[PDB]
Design a protein around this motif. Structure first.
Motif, mmCIF file in Angstrom:
data_model
loop_
_atom_site.group_PDB
_atom_site.id
_atom_site.type_symbol
_atom_site.label_atom_id
_atom_site.label_comp_id
_atom_site.label_asym_id
_atom_site.label_seq_id
_atom_site.Cartn_x
_atom_site.Cartn_y
_atom_site.Cartn_z
ATOM 1 N N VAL A 20 -41.101 -31.948 -5.642
ATOM 2 C CA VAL A 20 -39.458 -31.853 -5.988
ATOM 3 C C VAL A 20 -38.663 -31.681 -4.742
ATOM 4 O O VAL A 20 -39.105 -31.307 -3.734
ATOM 5 C CB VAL A 20 -39.083 -30.683 -6.993
ATOM 6 C CG1 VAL A 20 -39.407 -30.999 -8.449
ATOM 7 C CG2 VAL A 20 -39.667 -29.572 -6.117
ATOM 8 N N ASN A 40 -50.726 -21.167 -9.690
ATOM 9 C CA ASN A 40 -51.872 -22.032 -10.552
ATOM 10 C C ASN A 40 -51.871 -23.412 -10.127
ATOM 11 O O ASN A 40 -50.635 -24.140 -10.013
ATOM 12 C CB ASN A 40 -51.872 -21.745 -11.843
ATOM 13 C CG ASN A 40 -52.799 -22.455 -12.689
ATOM 14 O OD1 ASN A 40 -53.053 -23.578 -12.850
ATOM 15 N ND2 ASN A 40 -53.658 -21.558 -13.158
ATOM 16 N N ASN A 96 -45.478 -36.643 -5.890
ATOM 17 C CA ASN A 96 -45.593 -35.774 -6.947
ATOM 18 C C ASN A 96 -44.569 -34.533 -6.783
ATOM 19 O O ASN A 96 -44.165 -33.771 -7.879
ATOM 20 C CB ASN A 96 -46.897 -35.036 -7.017
ATOM 21 C CG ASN A 96 -47.806 -35.817 -8.008
ATOM 22 O OD1 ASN A 96 -47.464 -36.830 -8.805
ATOM 23 N ND2 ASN A 96 -49.037 -35.485 -7.899
ATOM 24 N N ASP A 113 -57.491 -24.957 -13.251
ATOM 25 C CA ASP A 113 -57.256 -25.423 -14.568
ATOM 26 C C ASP A 113 -56.577 -24.072 -15.406
ATOM 27 O O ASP A 113 -57.241 -23.495 -15.868
ATOM 28 C CB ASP A 113 -58.554 -25.496 -14.959
ATOM 29 C CG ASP A 113 -58.578 -26.327 -16.419
ATOM 30 O OD1 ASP A 113 -57.498 -26.779 -16.805
ATOM 31 O OD2 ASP A 113 -59.545 -26.764 -16.959
ATOM 32 N N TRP A 163 -54.778 -27.008 -9.896
ATOM 33 C CA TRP A 163 -56.277 -27.331 -9.799
ATOM 34 C C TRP A 163 -56.838 -28.218 -8.700
ATOM 35 O O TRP A 163 -58.100 -28.433 -8.638
ATOM 36 C CB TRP A 163 -56.638 -27.718 -11.049
ATOM 37 C CG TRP A 163 -56.578 -29.225 -11.538
ATOM 38 C CD1 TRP A 163 -55.393 -29.811 -10.881
ATOM 39 C CD2 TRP A 163 -56.911 -29.806 -12.633
ATOM 40 N NE1 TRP A 163 -55.398 -31.147 -11.823
ATOM 41 C CE2 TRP A 163 -56.407 -31.054 -13.023
ATOM 42 C CE3 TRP A 163 -57.740 -29.338 -13.747
ATOM 43 C CZ2 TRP A 163 -56.751 -31.906 -13.836
ATOM 44 C CZ3 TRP A 163 -58.091 -30.352 -14.696
ATOM 45 C CH2 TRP A 163 -57.503 -31.637 -14.776
ATOM 46 N N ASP A 164 -56.039 -29.044 -8.204
ATOM 47 C CA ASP A 164 -56.420 -30.189 -7.040
ATOM 48 C C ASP A 164 -56.715 -29.185 -5.519
ATOM 49 O O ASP A 164 -56.126 -28.698 -5.005
ATOM 50 C CB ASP A 164 -55.294 -31.137 -6.762
ATOM 51 C CG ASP A 164 -55.381 -32.245 -5.780
ATOM 52 O OD1 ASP A 164 -55.886 -32.011 -4.674
ATOM 53 O OD2 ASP A 164 -55.908 -33.402 -6.222
ATOM 54 N N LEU A 179 -47.017 -28.625 -3.775
ATOM 55 C CA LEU A 179 -46.691 -28.292 -2.226
ATOM 56 C C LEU A 179 -45.963 -26.902 -2.427
ATOM 57 O O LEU A 179 -45.894 -26.175 -1.393
ATOM 58 C CB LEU A 179 -46.010 -29.319 -1.706
ATOM 59 C CG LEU A 179 -46.866 -30.439 -1.522
ATOM 60 C CD1 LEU A 179 -45.587 -31.477 -0.906
ATOM 61 C CD2 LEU A 179 -47.586 -30.285 -0.408
ATOM 62 N N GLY A 180 -45.725 -26.306 -3.496
ATOM 63 C CA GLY A 180 -44.912 -25.073 -3.484
ATOM 64 C C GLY A 180 -43.451 -25.330 -3.583
ATOM 65 O O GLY A 180 -42.497 -24.378 -2.873
ATOM 66 N N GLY A 218 -43.097 -27.839 -12.891
ATOM 67 C CA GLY A 218 -42.876 -29.375 -12.965
ATOM 68 C C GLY A 218 -43.975 -29.920 -13.672
ATOM 69 O O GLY A 218 -45.035 -30.116 -12.834
ATOM 70 N N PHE A 226 -41.046 -25.487 -5.607
ATOM 71 C CA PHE A 226 -40.506 -24.546 -6.347
ATOM 72 C C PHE A 226 -40.327 -22.952 -5.880
ATOM 73 O O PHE A 226 -39.379 -22.258 -6.058
ATOM 74 C CB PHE A 226 -40.986 -24.393 -7.912
ATOM 75 C CG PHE A 226 -40.309 -25.234 -8.877
ATOM 76 C CD1 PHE A 226 -39.184 -24.813 -9.616
ATOM 77 C CD2 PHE A 226 -41.040 -26.488 -9.430
ATOM 78 C CE1 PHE A 226 -38.725 -25.484 -10.695
ATOM 79 C CE2 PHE A 226 -40.648 -27.315 -10.303
ATOM 80 C CZ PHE A 226 -39.298 -26.933 -10.871
ATOM 81 N N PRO A 250 -46.865 -32.711 -15.250
ATOM 82 C CA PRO A 250 -47.245 -34.064 -14.865
ATOM 83 C C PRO A 250 -46.530 -35.073 -15.746
ATOM 84 O O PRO A 250 -46.167 -34.816 -17.079
ATOM 85 C CB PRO A 250 -48.807 -34.041 -15.552
ATOM 86 C CG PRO A 250 -49.238 -32.708 -15.343
ATOM 87 C CD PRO A 250 -48.089 -31.736 -15.559
HETATM 88 N N1 LIG Z 1 -54.669 -28.581 -15.710
HETATM 89 C C1 LIG Z 1 -54.207 -28.072 -14.480
HETATM 90 N N2 LIG Z 1 -54.346 -27.174 -14.161
HETATM 91 C C2 LIG Z 1 -53.892 -26.664 -13.029
HETATM 92 N N3 LIG Z 1 -53.176 -27.731 -12.353
HETATM 93 C C3 LIG Z 1 -53.086 -28.923 -12.996
HETATM 94 C C4 LIG Z 1 -53.495 -29.189 -14.210
HETATM 95 N N4 LIG Z 1 -53.206 -30.493 -14.505
HETATM 96 C C5 LIG Z 1 -52.305 -30.830 -13.523
HETATM 97 N N5 LIG Z 1 -52.159 -30.013 -12.482
HETATM 98 C C6 LIG Z 1 -51.477 -30.229 -11.139
HETATM 99 O O1 LIG Z 1 -50.430 -30.633 -11.996
HETATM 100 C C7 LIG Z 1 -49.409 -30.807 -10.849
HETATM 101 C C8 LIG Z 1 -48.126 -31.656 -11.199
HETATM 102 S S1 LIG Z 1 -46.650 -32.298 -10.026
HETATM 103 C C9 LIG Z 1 -46.402 -30.508 -9.042
HETATM 104 C C10 LIG Z 1 -45.567 -30.731 -7.785
HETATM 105 C C11 LIG Z 1 -44.685 -29.617 -7.739
HETATM 106 N N6 LIG Z 1 -43.747 -29.509 -8.569
HETATM 107 C C12 LIG Z 1 -44.126 -29.568 -6.198
HETATM 108 O O2 LIG Z 1 -43.425 -28.876 -5.773
HETATM 109 O O3 LIG Z 1 -45.313 -29.559 -5.285
HETATM 110 C C13 LIG Z 1 -50.484 -31.845 -9.974
HETATM 111 O O4 LIG Z 1 -50.433 -31.487 -8.570
HETATM 112 C C14 LIG Z 1 -51.765 -31.738 -10.667
HETATM 113 O O5 LIG Z 1 -52.755 -31.780 -9.662
#
Ligand SMILES: Nc1ncnc2c1ncn2[C@@H]1O[C@H](CSCC[C@H](N)C(=O)O)[C@@H](O)[C@H]1O
Length: 327
Positions: free
Chosen positions: A306, A39, A304, A60, A41-42, A21-22, A78, A24, A80
């Motif tokens: 913060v 960066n 997911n 990715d 990927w979803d 969500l941004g 942050g 950070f 996974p």
């Molecule tokens: N290989 C990769 N490349 C890019 N994004 C990836 C990835 N593997 C996982 N992600 C993304 O990793 C994220 C971790 S949780 C991120 C939450 C963020 N801290 C907040 O403020 O919103 C997930 O959204 C997942 O979709």
DNA sequence: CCATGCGCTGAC
DNA sequence: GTCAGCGCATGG
């Protein structure tokens, strides 16, 4: 979130990796910094980020040449948690999702930023009898960085949610920084009951179950603790009902149950789950952040993420120490 | 994709 | 004993 008057990071630059969500990014900009790369990927998360920020993140991280990445002062991440959480199978480094850390290590060896700021769940500090944590400390040291790590609970920094996470701050060694400190705790003055929407907007989330077994009585005064009131079914995750005169439990991204992801709360006589906007509030998001149109994708997204407020307190301190250069 | 019933782990 | 968890696994 909180408003910052002393913009201590004006002029510095950072990158938003594993964006989601941004969170950070909202935290770091409130202090004056500029974002020059994101960066994630979803598909769906890229849709919200672009909608609130107006730019689309790359994809990715595993097939991106670390040499294409813009110069930057602070790297944010942050990563996974599934391969570390206390809710899963605990596979760690052996898990296809538990290796993303070494991709950050790749980027750091080539770009060498001034600061590295990472966040993860509580179990990560103990997993594998603490070896997992020690692989991170020793790697950052080899790369020529110092290492600071601590577990902070959100109920101690102004937000009423029982969310314990580990935070890791790292400084490059030629900067000689010797006075970084984690923010100090204070009293909670906002409870779940002060953040909810009017009954006319959450009627569709009301649930009348017949196996409702009330096992405690509603409390009279506000407490900074989760107070359980009842159960449905067998009482596992997603079937526990809490009081609104206390604080909320941790939101999750892949949770289940009748009151999936948010938890159930006893409001004005009836039990119901939380609305997306209410989820925003318990994470510290301003009412102006636009949520994703799919209710399902939004719950996952806040699960997911913060808590903004806590990130804001930490970023000011990073700045205070970087700006102390006497003769 | 979306919903909902688990059934185990950890830190007291 | 007691309770909480950025989750797993199957159904349409
Ligand atoms: N290989 C990769 N490349 C890019 N994004 C990836 C990835 N593997 C996982 N992600 C993304 O990793 C994220 C971790 S949780 C991120 C939450 C963020 N801290 C907040 O403020 O919103 C997930 O959204 C997942 O979709």
């Amino acid at each position: 979130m909180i408003e910052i008057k002393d913009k201590q990071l004006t002029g510095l630059r950072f990158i938003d990796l594993f964006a989601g969500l941004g969170g950070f990014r909202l935290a770091l900009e409130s202090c004056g910094a500029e974002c020059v790369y994101s960066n994630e990927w979803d598909k769906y998360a890229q849709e919200v980020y672009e909608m609130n920020f107006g730019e689309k993140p790359e994809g990715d991280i595993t097939q991106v040449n670390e040499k294409t990445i813009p110069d930057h002062d602070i790297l944010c991440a942050g990563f996974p948690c599934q391969a570390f959480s206390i809710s899963g199978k605990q596979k760690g480094f052996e898990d296809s999702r538990g290796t993303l850390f070494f991709d950050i290590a790749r980027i750091v060896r080539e770009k060498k930023p001034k600061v590295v700021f990472m966040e993860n769940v509580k179990n990560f500090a103990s997993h594998d009898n603490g070896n997992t944590l020690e692989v991170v400390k020793n790697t950052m040291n080899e790369l020529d960085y110092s290492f600071h790590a601590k577990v902070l609970n959100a109920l101690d920094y102004g937000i009423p949610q029982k969310r314990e996470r580990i935070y890791m701050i790292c400084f490059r060694n030629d900067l000689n920084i010797q006075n970084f400190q984690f923010p100090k705790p204070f009293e909670l003055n906002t409870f779940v009951k002060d953040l909810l929407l009017p009954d006319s907007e959450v009627e569709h989330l009301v649930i009348d179950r017949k196996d409702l077994v009330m096992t405690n009585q509603e409390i009279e005064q506000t407490t900074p603790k989760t107070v359980r009131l009842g159960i449905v079914g067998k009482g596992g995750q997603g079937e526990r009902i809490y009081s609104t005169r206390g604080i909320a439990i941790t939101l999750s991204a892949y949770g289940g149950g009748i009151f999936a992801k948010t938890g159930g709360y006893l409001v004005n006589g009836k039990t119901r789950k939380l609305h997306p906007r209410e989820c925003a509030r318990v994470m510290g998001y301003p009412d102006s952040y636009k949520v994703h149109p799919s209710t399902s994708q939004a719950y996952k997204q806040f699960g997911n993420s913060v808590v903004i407020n806590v990130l804001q307190y930490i970023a000011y301190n990073i700045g205070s120490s970087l700006n102390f250069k006497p003769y």
